[model samples]
Target: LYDLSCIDTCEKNSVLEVIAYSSSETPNRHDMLLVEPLNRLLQDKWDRFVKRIFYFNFFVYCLYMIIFTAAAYYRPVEGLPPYKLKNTVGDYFRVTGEILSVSGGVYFFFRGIQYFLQRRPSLKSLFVDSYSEILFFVQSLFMLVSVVLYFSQRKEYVASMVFSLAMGWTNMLYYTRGFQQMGIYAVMIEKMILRDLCRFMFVYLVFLFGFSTAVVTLIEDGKYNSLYSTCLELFKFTIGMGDLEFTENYDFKAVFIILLLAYVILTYILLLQMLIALMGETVNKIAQESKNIWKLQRAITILDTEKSFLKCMRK
Candidate 1:
């Protein structure tokens, strides 16, 4: 009944106009029907929880970055080649390590402030608020931990692995929280589909590449090389190569078979997950495109109505 004929075409606009028109009346109806009942659902309560999580996540990130930067600058090895290992903090690894660490800290800090405003937090006497006090406490603790860890263990690889895992965890948490704060109702369907697909793909790719490299590194170390070679020889024997010597009752052949089977299964699972995510994303995109086309038709109708209204005014 809301004369949307002047606004858009009847194609999808008819359906959307009906919904929007109905929504326009919602405030009055809501005030009359359930205003008092829903007062507790106001933004302030949720704002506090969001700020807490955001600040905590940011603090963890700062700690992670500081630890990573220090570790990279002070590798455990003694006087390695200058080309092989630069002592300056400006080296590629050192710089990259600092960037990711600082990035994590900065991202959460800004996101927290944004959510604070969106949630309508009481900024009156901002510094005296409990939120500010909590922030200071958490950041101080984080700094303490970071300083201790840096001096205790000057191991770059271990530091990197831990920091990467922490950053990954932070991302997952923030994404989930964002969904809870801002439900995915108004976003373009294609964008939402792409966002989710990217998240899943990112996690899978990181784990696959990281874990694979780690397994290979473990195998190549001097202590583990003999075990790897024994396994390789056993594999050759299984495929009808010349038999290996079993000097002193070693279970080398069995160990090799186990490692080979473990890697095979691990790779197969990783591929399977990636394939499933890809197919799911494809279906979502197709559906989003169809919806967008219908929305476009409605828009064209609105444009047509505007043109007719302009002609009438001229007359």
Candidate 2:
């Protein structure tokens, strides 16, 4: 592979080759892209390419919505999405949906192995750098797994398909971020979730779990009630949103009240209060640089996707 750089469109006879550039002191520069010369050319081209891919991905997104909608929904309980796709020609739907799903989805995992092979960057860089691509690959992997499971008429095929709907929809965010307007929210969620909120969850979980177990011990339901149920109930207590005074065990009431207050001050007040503070702080801190973040995100998206299409379409 050779990395050839310049392309002059005006060199020999303006047909055999090429050439091109701008000025200073605010010169009256011209433009073919109906924009500035160099900077304008750069902007218009990139912007156009982005929109091109964005529209194409939207089409791809549309393909999936229709397929899954037709393949997955319909009933007497929900809003009548024509569930006949499931029961009427049920066998036909699964067989056909399974094929179209992969045929459409295969390009994604195409990235997983393509990225790995090209980078050959060993395990660490392979995963760290191209994690997004791998996720698509992983989704398709599970899709195939689902088809196998579905082939046997087994359930959890239903479960897998349901979760698959969620995963595919979230993937829409990637394509959405290609536009200038949507980029801000996309970047914000990524930054906030990855850095600030991520750290907060660890300590917050510690409080929820400890208090949950504490409440579990106090409850005399006697049928081995789940710790998970208590955790959710305790979660409401941490959020200061739930109030339940139900308890038959009076002997432990005194100690329970003490722990309740302890949980209140530590988790309810400090944990959530600081979480609120952290979120506020991040938005303000990253407010200005968000444009740059959005730009880089789209650029990264552009490169990966362009490479993916070419990788498959190439030899």
Candidate 3:
């Protein structure tokens, strides 16, 4: 916490000199007798706090990575096909895809933040204004395509998902580095650099809920081919259907009313949330870019005012 006097001197390029000032003249000035001790104490405390925060964030990131990886590769139930309810190949691919998609979102979101903080533009500058929304929509299309392909190709869904995930993660890395290069003097550079760090946590929680629900529903109904099938079982179960199965259930007729209502609700909510997250990014990007334009306008105005003032003085 450098004082106002220290910042003032530094900004004006002032030379330091040892001088005695009256207490009345410099109310905030420290007593010479305690200056050295106070400086040492403050420096030590600041260093410790920064180091602690850095390590704590690092540990949290590591934990998240570990959990994500474990969920990706783990086989929950024994004697089940990798692509089936107990242990599906699609599950692994879905994990990969979600991780990739979320990573891309985080990547662009943080890059956008950096663009604002550093007050500069890069390759993404043109699209940063629309990247969040556009990418999200694109990703959602990819997800829908994946879903469609899952039923059509069946065996190829996992492969397609993995490829998409890889592409997304790569894009994220590219833009992140680009953001760093564009802004050499970023404000809150640490936060700027690690801005996506928190997003991973957000991704983890969302993924955890979505994945867990999908997995549990799959287990309960024994359907792995389609989201529709899973939703159908849940719908029936929700409305006093008494555990209806996807494939030719014993009481299918009895639960028809409940199942129909439940499926509608589940499907609608899932699609809604997915689309919201997808489209919401674009809305945010628009707002951010508008703000950045204002900042640049202000900077230009300041520069113009200074130039006018200098010309007047010269005259």
- The digit string of per-residue lDDT tens for model 2 on 1-315 reads 222222123333221011111111213222222223433433454575646766887887778767865666631223322223444576576547656776666666675667667555375242332444555666667666666666565655666666666677776676656677687787777778878887999898998888878877777674324787767766787656655554444468778678777877888888889998989999999875565556545545544554455643311
Q: Say which candidate scores most in lDDT.
A: 2
As for model 3, its CA RMSD to the true structure in angstroms is 20.3
TM-score per model over all chains: 0.25, 0.72, 0.24
Best TM-score goes to which candidate?
2
Over 114-218, each residue of candidate 3 has an lDDT whose tens digit, in order, gives 545544434444433334334433533444455556557454545554544444443332122112232212212323223433544455345434543543443
RMSD of each: 17.1, 9.3, 20.3
What are the Cα lDDT values of the candidates? 0.41, 0.60, 0.40
Q: Cα lDDT of model 3 overall?
A: 0.40
Stretches off by above 4 angstroms in model 1 are 1-255, 262-266, 269-315
* Candidate 1 steric clashes: 3
> In model 3, where is the ten-residue run with the lowest total lDDT?
14-23
Candidate no. 2 TM-score: 0.72
Q: Arrange candidates, best lDDT first.
A: 2, 1, 3
